[PDB]
mmCIF file of C-alpha atoms and ligand atoms in Angstrom:
data_model
loop_
_atom_site.group_PDB
_atom_site.id
_atom_site.type_symbol
_atom_site.label_atom_id
_atom_site.label_comp_id
_atom_site.label_asym_id
_atom_site.label_seq_id
_atom_site.Cartn_x
_atom_site.Cartn_y
_atom_site.Cartn_z
ATOM 1 C CA UNK N 1 -38.330 121.151 105.176
ATOM 2 C CA UNK N 2 -36.497 120.960 108.576
ATOM 3 C CA UNK N 3 -35.698 118.301 111.291
ATOM 4 C CA UNK N 4 -36.326 120.926 114.087
ATOM 5 C CA UNK N 5 -39.882 121.402 112.581
ATOM 6 C CA UNK N 6 -40.429 117.601 113.118
ATOM 7 C CA UNK N 7 -38.720 117.968 116.592
ATOM 8 C CA UNK N 15 -29.208 116.084 120.636
ATOM 9 C CA UNK N 16 -30.146 118.764 117.973
ATOM 10 C CA UNK N 17 -30.908 122.541 118.226
ATOM 11 C CA UNK N 18 -32.400 125.164 115.804
ATOM 12 C CA UNK N 19 -29.787 127.211 113.817
ATOM 13 C CA UNK N 20 -30.104 130.977 113.040
ATOM 14 C CA UNK N 21 -29.296 130.409 109.299
ATOM 15 C CA UNK N 22 -32.035 128.886 107.018
ATOM 16 C CA UNK N 23 -31.278 125.278 105.856
ATOM 17 C CA UNK N 24 -28.821 124.627 108.762
ATOM 18 C CA UNK N 25 -29.140 122.652 112.038
ATOM 19 C CA UNK N 26 -27.015 122.413 115.225
ATOM 20 C CA UNK N 27 -25.878 119.042 116.689
ATOM 21 C CA UNK N 28 -24.130 118.823 120.130
ATOM 22 C CA UNK N 29 -20.349 118.728 119.366
ATOM 23 C CA UNK N 30 -18.553 115.387 120.153
ATOM 24 C CA UNK N 31 -14.784 115.235 119.420
ATOM 25 C CA UNK N 32 -14.694 112.066 117.234
ATOM 26 C CA UNK N 33 -17.625 113.414 115.130
ATOM 27 C CA UNK N 34 -16.065 116.911 114.666
ATOM 28 C CA UNK N 35 -12.725 115.243 113.666
ATOM 29 C CA UNK N 36 -14.610 112.963 111.187
ATOM 30 C CA UNK N 37 -16.766 115.719 109.558
ATOM 31 C CA UNK N 38 -13.662 117.942 109.101
ATOM 32 C CA UNK N 39 -11.868 115.028 107.303
ATOM 33 C CA UNK N 40 -14.991 114.126 105.260
ATOM 34 C CA UNK N 41 -15.322 117.694 103.751
ATOM 35 C CA UNK N 42 -11.877 117.059 102.068
ATOM 36 C CA UNK N 43 -12.647 113.370 101.153
ATOM 37 C CA UNK N 44 -14.278 111.569 98.174
ATOM 38 C CA UNK N 45 -17.289 111.188 100.586
ATOM 39 C CA UNK N 46 -17.828 115.037 100.844
ATOM 40 C CA UNK N 47 -21.165 114.925 98.881
ATOM 41 C CA UNK N 48 -22.352 111.718 100.672
ATOM 42 C CA UNK N 49 -22.509 113.388 104.149
ATOM 43 C CA UNK N 50 -24.242 116.556 105.404
ATOM 44 C CA UNK N 51 -22.237 119.788 104.778
ATOM 45 C CA UNK N 52 -20.165 120.697 107.892
ATOM 46 C CA UNK N 53 -19.688 124.490 108.383
ATOM 47 C CA UNK N 54 -17.580 124.345 111.606
ATOM 48 C CA UNK N 55 -18.460 124.783 115.325
ATOM 49 C CA UNK N 56 -20.618 127.503 117.029
ATOM 50 C CA UNK N 57 -21.103 128.220 120.796
ATOM 51 C CA UNK N 58 -24.702 128.415 122.194
ATOM 52 C CA UNK N 59 -25.444 128.823 125.977
ATOM 53 C CA UNK N 60 -21.734 128.005 126.709
ATOM 54 C CA UNK N 61 -21.953 124.705 124.701
ATOM 55 C CA UNK N 62 -20.264 123.572 121.407
ATOM 56 C CA UNK N 63 -22.518 122.669 118.394
ATOM 57 C CA UNK N 64 -21.620 121.279 114.941
ATOM 58 C CA UNK N 65 -23.199 123.603 112.301
ATOM 59 C CA UNK N 66 -24.676 121.103 109.753
ATOM 60 C CA UNK N 67 -26.700 121.114 106.547
ATOM 61 C CA UNK N 68 -30.342 120.331 107.460
ATOM 62 C CA UNK N 69 -30.867 117.327 105.100
ATOM 63 C CA UNK N 70 -34.707 117.816 105.288
ATOM 64 C CA UNK N 71 -34.541 121.450 103.938
ATOM 65 C CA UNK N 72 -34.809 120.414 100.217
ATOM 66 C CA UNK N 73 -38.014 118.337 100.760
ATOM 67 C CA UNK N 74 -41.782 119.108 100.919
ATOM 68 C CA UNK N 75 -43.165 116.906 103.763
ATOM 69 C CA UNK N 76 -40.155 114.532 103.963
ATOM 70 C CA UNK N 77 -40.484 110.793 104.771
ATOM 71 C CA UNK N 78 -37.326 109.647 106.672
ATOM 72 C CA UNK N 79 -35.847 106.177 107.308
ATOM 73 C CA UNK N 80 -32.634 105.810 109.405
ATOM 74 C CA UNK N 81 -30.650 102.610 108.707
ATOM 75 C CA UNK N 82 -27.804 101.722 111.180
ATOM 76 C CA UNK N 83 -24.875 100.281 109.151
ATOM 77 C CA UNK N 84 -22.513 97.523 110.298
ATOM 78 C CA UNK N 85 -22.500 93.926 111.626
ATOM 79 C CA UNK N 86 -21.133 95.416 114.923
ATOM 80 C CA UNK N 87 -22.721 98.434 116.714
ATOM 81 C CA UNK N 88 -20.216 99.065 119.605
ATOM 82 C CA UNK N 89 -16.434 99.879 119.753
ATOM 83 C CA UNK N 90 -13.897 97.117 120.663
ATOM 84 C CA UNK N 91 -12.846 99.298 123.695
ATOM 85 C CA UNK N 92 -16.402 98.737 125.151
ATOM 86 C CA UNK N 93 -15.627 94.938 125.234
ATOM 87 C CA UNK N 94 -12.372 95.555 127.201
ATOM 88 C CA UNK N 95 -14.111 98.040 129.602
ATOM 89 C CA UNK N 96 -16.981 95.507 130.161
ATOM 90 C CA UNK N 97 -14.462 92.760 131.155
ATOM 91 C CA UNK N 98 -12.197 94.979 133.377
ATOM 92 C CA UNK N 99 -14.809 97.422 134.861
ATOM 93 C CA UNK N 100 -18.404 96.506 133.844
ATOM 94 C CA UNK N 101 -21.161 99.171 134.185
ATOM 95 C CA UNK N 102 -24.351 97.093 134.810
ATOM 96 C CA UNK N 103 -27.512 98.565 133.170
ATOM 97 C CA UNK N 104 -30.958 97.623 134.635
ATOM 98 C CA UNK N 105 -32.792 99.542 131.812
ATOM 99 C CA UNK N 106 -31.131 97.179 129.241
ATOM 100 C CA UNK N 107 -31.932 94.007 131.295
ATOM 101 C CA UNK N 108 -35.672 95.066 131.401
ATOM 102 C CA UNK N 109 -35.951 95.549 127.573
ATOM 103 C CA UNK N 110 -34.277 92.122 126.982
ATOM 104 C CA UNK N 111 -36.673 90.280 129.349
ATOM 105 C CA UNK N 112 -39.572 92.038 127.477
ATOM 106 C CA UNK N 113 -38.444 90.853 123.963
ATOM 107 C CA UNK N 114 -37.142 87.406 125.197
ATOM 108 C CA UNK N 115 -37.565 86.210 128.825
ATOM 109 C CA UNK N 116 -35.006 83.348 128.264
ATOM 110 C CA UNK N 117 -32.319 85.684 126.695
ATOM 111 C CA UNK N 118 -30.690 86.855 129.999
ATOM 112 C CA UNK N 119 -28.411 84.349 131.844
ATOM 113 C CA UNK N 120 -29.135 83.219 135.458
ATOM 114 C CA UNK N 121 -26.476 85.772 136.680
ATOM 115 C CA UNK N 122 -27.907 88.681 134.608
ATOM 116 C CA UNK N 123 -31.384 87.758 136.045
ATOM 117 C CA UNK N 124 -29.801 87.810 139.573
ATOM 118 C CA UNK N 125 -28.021 91.178 138.784
ATOM 119 C CA UNK N 126 -31.264 92.464 137.104
ATOM 120 C CA UNK N 127 -28.675 94.012 134.701
ATOM 121 C CA UNK N 128 -26.391 93.388 131.662
ATOM 122 C CA UNK N 129 -23.312 95.141 130.142
ATOM 123 C CA UNK N 130 -23.735 97.466 127.103
ATOM 124 C CA UNK N 131 -21.749 95.158 124.709
ATOM 125 C CA UNK N 132 -23.917 92.154 125.794
ATOM 126 C CA UNK N 133 -27.131 94.225 125.208
ATOM 127 C CA UNK N 134 -25.855 95.580 121.852
ATOM 128 C CA UNK N 135 -24.735 92.047 120.696
ATOM 129 C CA UNK N 136 -28.245 90.762 121.656
ATOM 130 C CA UNK N 137 -29.861 93.689 119.648
ATOM 131 C CA UNK N 138 -27.608 92.747 116.645
ATOM 132 C CA UNK N 139 -28.890 89.109 116.666
ATOM 133 C CA UNK N 140 -32.705 89.697 116.983
ATOM 134 C CA UNK N 141 -32.412 92.368 114.190
ATOM 135 C CA UNK N 142 -30.825 92.110 110.685
ATOM 136 C CA UNK N 143 -27.479 93.576 112.001
ATOM 137 C CA UNK N 144 -25.612 90.215 112.566
ATOM 138 C CA UNK N 145 -26.854 88.443 109.341
ATOM 139 C CA UNK N 146 -27.228 91.354 106.815
ATOM 140 C CA UNK N 147 -24.869 94.031 108.312
ATOM 141 C CA UNK N 148 -27.521 96.773 108.756
ATOM 142 C CA UNK N 149 -30.844 97.347 110.529
ATOM 143 C CA UNK N 150 -33.790 99.740 110.223
ATOM 144 C CA UNK N 151 -33.892 101.929 113.381
ATOM 145 C CA UNK N 152 -36.803 104.295 112.627
ATOM 146 C CA UNK N 153 -39.242 105.949 110.192
ATOM 147 C CA UNK N 154 -40.690 109.506 110.278
ATOM 148 C CA UNK N 155 -43.692 109.658 107.835
ATOM 149 C CA UNK N 156 -45.191 112.615 105.858
ATOM 150 C CA UNK N 157 -48.368 112.420 108.110
ATOM 151 C CA UNK N 158 -46.191 113.357 111.195
ATOM 152 C CA UNK N 159 -46.308 109.714 112.446
ATOM 153 C CA UNK N 160 -42.981 108.182 113.664
ATOM 154 C CA UNK N 161 -42.036 104.541 114.491
ATOM 155 C CA UNK N 162 -39.007 102.802 116.128
ATOM 156 C CA UNK N 163 -40.829 99.374 116.300
ATOM 157 C CA UNK N 164 -38.184 97.417 114.249
ATOM 158 C CA UNK N 165 -36.109 95.720 117.040
ATOM 159 C CA UNK N 166 -37.104 92.211 115.652
ATOM 160 C CA UNK N 167 -37.006 93.134 111.903
ATOM 161 C CA UNK N 168 -34.420 90.457 110.908
ATOM 162 C CA UNK N 169 -35.228 88.474 107.679
ATOM 163 C CA UNK N 170 -34.490 89.785 104.121
ATOM 164 C CA UNK N 171 -38.298 89.685 103.444
ATOM 165 C CA UNK N 172 -39.142 91.566 106.723
ATOM 166 C CA UNK N 173 -36.652 94.345 105.770
ATOM 167 C CA UNK N 174 -37.997 94.411 102.147
ATOM 168 C CA UNK N 175 -41.575 94.837 103.541
ATOM 169 C CA UNK N 176 -40.538 97.887 105.674
ATOM 170 C CA UNK N 177 -38.921 99.554 102.593
ATOM 171 C CA UNK N 178 -42.010 98.552 100.488
ATOM 172 C CA UNK N 179 -44.291 100.368 102.990
ATOM 173 C CA UNK N 180 -41.814 103.341 103.223
ATOM 174 C CA UNK N 181 -41.675 104.098 99.425
ATOM 175 C CA UNK N 182 -45.486 103.440 99.000
ATOM 176 C CA UNK N 183 -45.155 102.206 95.367
ATOM 177 C CA UNK N 184 -43.233 105.358 94.159
ATOM 178 C CA UNK N 185 -41.054 103.824 91.371
ATOM 179 C CA UNK N 186 -39.175 107.143 90.867
ATOM 180 C CA UNK N 187 -38.203 107.456 94.590
ATOM 181 C CA UNK N 188 -36.977 103.794 94.618
ATOM 182 C CA UNK N 189 -34.993 104.256 91.351
ATOM 183 C CA UNK N 190 -33.348 107.453 92.743
ATOM 184 C CA UNK N 191 -32.542 105.689 96.054
ATOM 185 C CA UNK N 192 -30.870 102.791 94.175
ATOM 186 C CA UNK N 193 -28.883 105.192 91.924
ATOM 187 C CA UNK N 194 -27.703 107.102 95.043
ATOM 188 C CA UNK N 195 -26.745 103.887 96.966
ATOM 189 C CA UNK N 196 -24.780 102.610 93.905
ATOM 190 C CA UNK N 197 -22.863 105.956 93.729
ATOM 191 C CA UNK N 198 -22.322 105.907 97.554
ATOM 192 C CA UNK N 199 -20.888 102.333 97.331
ATOM 193 C CA UNK N 200 -18.499 103.427 94.544
ATOM 194 C CA UNK N 201 -17.389 106.469 96.644
ATOM 195 C CA UNK N 202 -16.889 104.321 99.808
ATOM 196 C CA UNK N 203 -14.770 101.781 97.850
ATOM 197 C CA UNK N 204 -12.226 104.535 96.854
ATOM 198 C CA UNK N 205 -12.513 106.836 99.937
ATOM 199 C CA UNK N 206 -9.158 107.505 101.742
ATOM 200 C CA UNK N 207 -11.163 108.267 104.930
ATOM 201 C CA UNK N 208 -13.232 105.050 104.690
ATOM 202 C CA UNK N 209 -10.391 102.510 104.226
ATOM 203 C CA UNK N 210 -8.535 104.121 107.257
ATOM 204 C CA UNK N 211 -11.509 104.365 109.741
ATOM 205 C CA UNK N 212 -13.612 101.895 111.787
ATOM 206 C CA UNK N 213 -17.202 103.087 111.084
ATOM 207 C CA UNK N 214 -19.430 101.999 114.030
ATOM 208 C CA UNK N 215 -22.918 103.349 114.914
ATOM 209 C CA UNK N 216 -23.291 105.444 111.686
ATOM 210 C CA UNK N 217 -26.556 105.436 109.672
ATOM 211 C CA UNK N 218 -27.723 105.882 106.082
ATOM 212 C CA UNK N 219 -30.530 108.464 106.176
ATOM 213 C CA UNK N 220 -33.161 107.919 103.412
ATOM 214 C CA UNK N 221 -35.258 111.064 102.720
ATOM 215 C CA UNK N 222 -38.028 111.364 100.054
ATOM 216 C CA UNK N 223 -41.189 113.437 99.410
ATOM 217 C CA UNK N 224 -44.487 113.376 97.428
ATOM 218 C CA UNK N 225 -42.689 115.418 94.633
ATOM 219 C CA UNK N 226 -40.498 112.252 94.140
ATOM 220 C CA UNK N 227 -37.357 114.022 95.556
ATOM 221 C CA UNK N 228 -35.100 111.289 97.069
ATOM 222 C CA UNK N 229 -31.730 111.530 98.837
ATOM 223 C CA UNK N 230 -29.456 109.330 100.971
ATOM 224 C CA UNK N 231 -26.607 110.508 103.262
ATOM 225 C CA UNK N 232 -24.213 108.898 105.777
ATOM 226 C CA UNK N 233 -24.741 110.492 109.242
ATOM 227 C CA UNK N 234 -23.476 110.138 112.870
ATOM 228 C CA UNK N 235 -19.665 109.751 113.088
ATOM 229 C CA UNK N 236 -19.641 109.833 116.948
ATOM 230 C CA UNK N 237 -18.098 106.274 117.080
ATOM 231 C CA UNK N 238 -15.979 106.438 113.876
ATOM 232 C CA UNK N 239 -12.256 106.169 114.784
ATOM 233 C CA UNK N 240 -8.966 105.953 112.803
ATOM 234 C CA UNK N 241 -6.857 102.739 112.561
ATOM 235 C CA UNK N 242 -3.082 102.802 113.280
ATOM 236 C CA UNK N 243 -1.143 104.311 110.289
ATOM 237 C CA UNK N 244 -0.643 101.828 107.380
ATOM 238 C CA UNK N 245 -3.590 99.671 108.658
ATOM 239 C CA UNK N 246 -6.841 99.559 106.582
ATOM 240 C CA UNK N 247 -10.194 97.668 106.800
ATOM 241 C CA UNK N 248 -11.933 95.942 103.848
ATOM 242 C CA UNK N 249 -15.379 96.560 105.527
ATOM 243 C CA UNK N 250 -16.713 93.157 104.227
ATOM 244 C CA UNK N 251 -14.792 90.392 106.114
ATOM 245 C CA UNK N 252 -16.234 89.031 109.410
ATOM 246 C CA UNK N 253 -15.427 90.873 112.675
ATOM 247 C CA UNK N 254 -12.963 89.035 115.006
ATOM 248 C CA UNK N 255 -12.012 90.937 118.215
ATOM 249 C CA UNK N 256 -8.742 92.787 117.384
ATOM 250 C CA UNK N 257 -9.354 93.181 113.588
ATOM 251 C CA UNK N 258 -11.777 96.173 114.154
ATOM 252 C CA UNK N 259 -13.805 95.093 111.029
ATOM 253 C CA UNK N 260 -17.323 96.716 110.946
ATOM 254 C CA UNK N 261 -19.016 94.838 108.008
ATOM 255 C CA UNK N 262 -20.215 98.276 106.678
ATOM 256 C CA UNK N 263 -19.993 97.259 102.967
ATOM 257 C CA UNK N 264 -21.473 93.780 103.632
ATOM 258 C CA UNK N 265 -24.442 95.845 104.943
ATOM 259 C CA UNK N 266 -24.520 98.182 101.933
ATOM 260 C CA UNK N 267 -24.182 95.227 99.460
ATOM 261 C CA UNK N 268 -27.170 93.493 101.148
ATOM 262 C CA UNK N 269 -29.206 96.753 101.346
ATOM 263 C CA UNK N 270 -28.681 97.469 97.605
ATOM 264 C CA UNK N 271 -29.667 93.810 96.842
ATOM 265 C CA UNK N 272 -32.918 94.090 98.863
ATOM 266 C CA UNK N 273 -33.950 97.452 97.293
ATOM 267 C CA UNK N 274 -33.034 96.013 93.810
ATOM 268 C CA UNK N 275 -35.342 93.008 94.616
ATOM 269 C CA UNK N 276 -38.120 95.455 95.690
ATOM 270 C CA UNK N 277 -37.701 97.343 92.342
ATOM 271 C CA UNK N 278 -38.288 94.047 90.357
ATOM 272 C CA UNK N 279 -41.583 93.365 92.294
HETATM 273 O O1 7I8 X 1 -28.009 106.604 117.530
HETATM 274 P P1 7I8 X 1 -28.134 106.361 119.020
HETATM 275 O O2 7I8 X 1 -27.933 107.617 119.836
HETATM 276 O O3 7I8 X 1 -29.398 105.609 119.383
HETATM 277 O O4 7I8 X 1 -26.907 105.379 119.428
HETATM 278 C C1 7I8 X 1 -27.201 104.013 119.792
HETATM 279 C C2 7I8 X 1 -27.751 103.920 121.197
HETATM 280 C C3 7I8 X 1 -28.646 102.697 121.405
HETATM 281 O O5 7I8 X 1 -29.641 102.629 120.391
HETATM 282 C C4 7I8 X 1 -29.284 102.750 122.784
HETATM 283 O O6 7I8 X 1 -30.163 101.618 122.930
HETATM 284 P P2 7I8 X 1 -31.575 100.971 122.451
HETATM 285 O O7 7I8 X 1 -32.258 102.069 121.659
HETATM 286 O O8 7I8 X 1 -31.222 99.769 121.605
HETATM 287 O O9 7I8 X 1 -32.331 100.606 123.712
HETATM 288 C C5 7I8 X 1 -28.227 102.725 123.880
HETATM 289 O O10 7I8 X 1 -28.836 102.876 125.157
HETATM 290 C C6 7I8 X 1 -27.272 103.881 123.631
HETATM 291 O O11 7I8 X 1 -26.225 103.858 124.622
HETATM 292 P P3 7I8 X 1 -26.086 104.677 126.021
HETATM 293 O O12 7I8 X 1 -27.311 104.293 126.826
HETATM 294 O O13 7I8 X 1 -26.069 106.146 125.646
HETATM 295 O O14 7I8 X 1 -24.792 104.212 126.650
HETATM 296 C C7 7I8 X 1 -26.660 103.803 122.244
HETATM 297 O O15 7I8 X 1 -25.746 104.901 122.056
HETATM 298 P P4 7I8 X 1 -24.133 104.988 121.883
HETATM 299 O O16 7I8 X 1 -23.596 105.117 123.294
HETATM 300 O O17 7I8 X 1 -23.729 103.695 121.211
HETATM 301 O O18 7I8 X 1 -23.850 106.212 121.036
HETATM 302 N N1 ADP X 2 -27.799 116.694 109.065
HETATM 303 C C1 ADP X 2 -29.029 116.305 109.392
HETATM 304 N N2 ADP X 2 -30.080 116.957 108.844
HETATM 305 C C2 ADP X 2 -31.317 116.575 109.179
HETATM 306 N N3 ADP X 2 -31.700 115.638 110.038
HETATM 307 C C3 ADP X 2 -30.642 115.021 110.586
HETATM 308 C C4 ADP X 2 -29.311 115.286 110.322
HETATM 309 N N4 ADP X 2 -28.497 114.448 111.068
HETATM 310 C C5 ADP X 2 -29.336 113.710 111.751
HETATM 311 N N5 ADP X 2 -30.654 113.998 111.505
HETATM 312 C C6 ADP X 2 -31.828 113.404 112.140
HETATM 313 O O1 ADP X 2 -31.526 113.154 113.497
HETATM 314 C C7 ADP X 2 -31.518 111.726 113.756
HETATM 315 C C8 ADP X 2 -30.367 111.390 114.673
HETATM 316 O O2 ADP X 2 -29.112 111.841 114.074
HETATM 317 P P1 ADP X 2 -27.725 111.196 114.564
HETATM 318 O O3 ADP X 2 -26.580 111.847 113.848
HETATM 319 O O4 ADP X 2 -27.835 109.705 114.510
HETATM 320 O O5 ADP X 2 -27.665 111.664 116.103
HETATM 321 P P2 ADP X 2 -27.934 110.905 117.511
HETATM 322 O O6 ADP X 2 -27.310 109.529 117.400
HETATM 323 O O7 ADP X 2 -27.262 111.761 118.566
HETATM 324 O O8 ADP X 2 -29.443 110.851 117.674
HETATM 325 C C9 ADP X 2 -31.473 111.079 112.366
HETATM 326 O O9 ADP X 2 -32.056 109.782 112.355
HETATM 327 C C10 ADP X 2 -32.284 112.076 111.541
HETATM 328 O O10 ADP X 2 -33.670 111.885 111.713
HETATM 329 MN MN1 MN X 3 -26.956 107.943 115.744
#
């Protein structure tokens, strides 16, 4: 019914809307998307509003349509950081002790002798590590979180990596609802078709965006692309195919390798 009801975001005055802190790449992207083939595949963007001297994107609340929505957020791409973060990490690293601690926790032998000595790692190193223990590197997406109808939430998916492990999370998420799974697959097929023709999509590097899966006990089911905070345009005349492997300088994100794999896994789940 609303994300603020479950609760970066703030309550809107208008019913069915939500406010997200304004970032310049994301505002630029949403503006473009409202005039793109992908218009219906993203939350409606109504412009910017000022609240307590701060800028907020006025968005469709994707949960408004649903009665007790179940939510799964799926981070798309083989790569989860911008190329400019690699350059910045080489020239002027910002060491992060928080990130070192979480690594040691998951895998004590993951950090190098020097990272151990620093008690810190760079963001790109941490994010590359997160890509490899999850499905991101191999399948081009990863499950980040679920918010269930019983108010329960989970982010315990950092080591969800194999095709079967991912299938099992989706199996538990849809709880045997054949109609929700069919509607999700129909929506993902239509999203893939829209992405493959989108003028926006071929011309932008799409990093750190998610597919948001929403469904309810009335068998309502929707999927949207969200979070364009790290989506950036390529130089004019340059396009990405969104399937070929990333090689530093080619800015390839593996987004459609992710969506191809995701469709394949949900299609497998539907045959079970
Ligand atoms: O959708 P969200 O907001 O989670 O974006 C990804 C999110 C990542 O999930 C965090 O790590 P973990 O949750 O994996 O610990 C990481 O700490 C954080 O970076 P930072 O600390 O803000 O520099 C990074 O944000 P961004 O700067 O790329 O937008
Ligand atoms: N338009 C929206 N309507 C409803 N819920 C949303 C919307 N956009 C995002 N959310 C919720 O907020 C979470 C974070 O959104 P996101 O755009 O990734 O922002 P951030 O990265 O700053 O947390 C999503 O996983 C989802 O649960
Ligand atoms: Mn996000």
